[PDB]
Write a protein that binds this ligand. Structure first.
Ligand SMILES: CC(=O)N[C@H]1[C@H](OCC2CCCCC2)O[C@H](CO)[C@@H](O)[C@@H]1O
Length: 513
């Protein structure tokens, strides 16, 4: 392990953050060491921030110009100058805390220059502030009230709902209420949004919404708008798939089957149309090694930064340098970026560690590793998940110390491919025995078996239905897990093919119900 003095000589990065966090959790950072430390942290968010702040709280930060404004309370705000009054009224909790006479007084004060404040002040003098704001069609006010409390729910007329998409908050609002199945009056109201007024993710979610109310023509129009506006080919393909499922225009399915993006929708479309499986690149570097240490986390952070900041030309230089067997994962990483994501790379590094598992199991391991890390042995996430299989430290230690009782086990063993694959196999055994489907296993790998069990216990998820199991896959309540399952499923199909153990993606979908 590295001392704080030695870590401080390394460039700021997630690897440095991780090792600082490890010192903090073992209580090895003194109050004196902690003084300058926030400048040594690459991403000052989450657990590392909570741990540091148990040693040195931050008071910060009130803009010096407005300090005096925060000396007032609800009881004294009428004594404050007008600038101070308007600053404090940015907070709806503050407004809620005022007495109603003062809300009336302030509403008058601000009616000319800040009618937004007037509307909220008067709204909070009623028993339903959302109703008052909705009657005023105050869009900024609507989103402030929603951020204040998700519990307000009301029917919204055609005029109002068509104004909501213009606000930056709309996409997260729509996603949240549709995926969580909350705010049913808002959800029902959003059936009347004109597809002309939305695009991209918003349009797509409104399609999903329309499907849940069996408004299939409205759903098609939303999905079509999404297909026309999405920036990424994978997302476009997802929208075209829905267009096809709803109306069965064979030109939509043909377009999907010819996609340059390899995803579950384009794979399924190819299978339905007897189109050949997409071309998978074959990487076999003849040079065996270079000088790069694939077990050094700091060396990876450095080369990753270079790769991500490299111009079209510099990528070609790095490609040649890492064109070795030993650095195959880095090579494929560079090529994927270098070819602007048009070629399909599905490598199988450190294969000797999995070759004795059955092919179906190999494919699942490889599918997870590809998405988790692109097979970078010293990969570290923002939550400090570790290695190719991106184990969280808690689970790594449980398996390594309690279950397998590996002598001198340290969580950093997860950076060794033999360990990552072995632990991955071990955990995948647990999950698969309970869940069976590789899609459900993927959801549980990323999101936990608890979340997955709760989702599968619901009456409305992964049961029989007109648009199942595809609709259920759009309604997986955690965005990261929803996305992850789709990507790992695609990878799984590809690796099964590469290992001469092909399965039809249609069989996967049948077994989800
Ligand atoms: C290294 C890293 O941050 N990996 C994360 C991963 O990042 C995306 C990877 C895609 C390939 C290139 C490396 C990052 O997202 C997963 C969820 O989808 C996480 O579980 C995983 O920890």
């Amino acid at each position: 392990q590295y001392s704080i003095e030695k870590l401080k000589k390394e460039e700021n990065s997630l690897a440095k953050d991780y090792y600082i966090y490890r010192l903090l959790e073992k209580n090895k950072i003194s109050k004196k060491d902690a003084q300058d430390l926030n400048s040594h942290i690459f991403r000052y968010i989450g657990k590392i921030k909570s741990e540091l702040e148990k040693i040195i709280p931050l008071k910060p930060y009130i803009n010096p110009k407005y300090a005096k404004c925060y000396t007032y309370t609800a009881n004294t705000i009428l004594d404050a100058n007008l600038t101070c009054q308007s600053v404090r009224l940015n907070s709806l909790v503050f407004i809620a805390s005022l007495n109603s006479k003062d809300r009336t007084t302030l509403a008058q004060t601000f009616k000319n220059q800040r009618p937004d404040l007037t509307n909220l002040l008067l709204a909070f003098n009623t028993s339903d502030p959302m109703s008052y704001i909705v009657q005023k069609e105050d869009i900024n006010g609507f989103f402030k009230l929603y951020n204040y409390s998700k519990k307000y729910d009301l029917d919204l007329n055609t005029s109002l709902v068509n104004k909501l998409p213009n606000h930056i908050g709309f996409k997260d609002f729509a996603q949240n209420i549709i995926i969580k199945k909350e705010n049913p009056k808002f959800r029902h109201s959003m059936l009347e949004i004109n597809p002309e007024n939305v695009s991209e993710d918003s349009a797509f979610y409104l399609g999903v919404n329309a499907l849940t109310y069996d408004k299939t023509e409205l759903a098609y129009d939303f999905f079509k708008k999404a297909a026309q506006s999405f920036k990424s080919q994978s997302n476009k393909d997802n929208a075209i798939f829905w267009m096809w499922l709803i109306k069965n225009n064979e030109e939509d399915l043909k377009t999907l089957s010819q996609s340059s993006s390899l995803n579950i929708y384009s794979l399924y479309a190819k299978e339905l149309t007897n189109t050949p499986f997409p071309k998978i690149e074959s990487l076999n570097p003849s040079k065996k090694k270079n000088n790069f240490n694939m077990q050094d986390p700091f060396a990876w952070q450095k080369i990753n930064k270079q790769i991500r900041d490299a111009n079209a030309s510099q990528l070609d230089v790095l490609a040649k340098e890492f064109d070795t067997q030993e650095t195959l994962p880095i090579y494929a990483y560079i090529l994927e970026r270098k070819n602007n994501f048009k070629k399909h790379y599905f490598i199988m590094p450190y294969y000797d560690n999995i070759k004795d598992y059955n092919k179906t199991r190999q494919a699942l391991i490889l599918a997870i590793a590809r998405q988790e890390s692109r097979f970078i042995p010293t990969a570290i996430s923002v939550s400090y998940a570790l290695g190719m299989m991106q184990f969280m430290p808690f689970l790594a230690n449980h398996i390594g110390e309690k279950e397998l009782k590996i002598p001198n086990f340290d969580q950093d063993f997860m950076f060794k491919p033999e360990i990552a694959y072995y632990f991955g196999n071990y955990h995948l055994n647990y999950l698969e025995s309970r869940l069976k489907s590789p899609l459900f296993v993927a959801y549980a790998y990323n999101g936990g078996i608890g979340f997955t069990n709760r989702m599968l216990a619901r009456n409305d998820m992964f049961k029989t239905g007109k648009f199942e199991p595809f609709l259920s896959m759009e309604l997986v309540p955690y965005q990261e897990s929803r996305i992850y399952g789709k990507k790992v499923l695609a990878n799984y199909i590809v690796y099964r093919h590469l290992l001469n153990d092909s399965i039809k993606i249609s069989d996967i979908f049948e077994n989800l119900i």
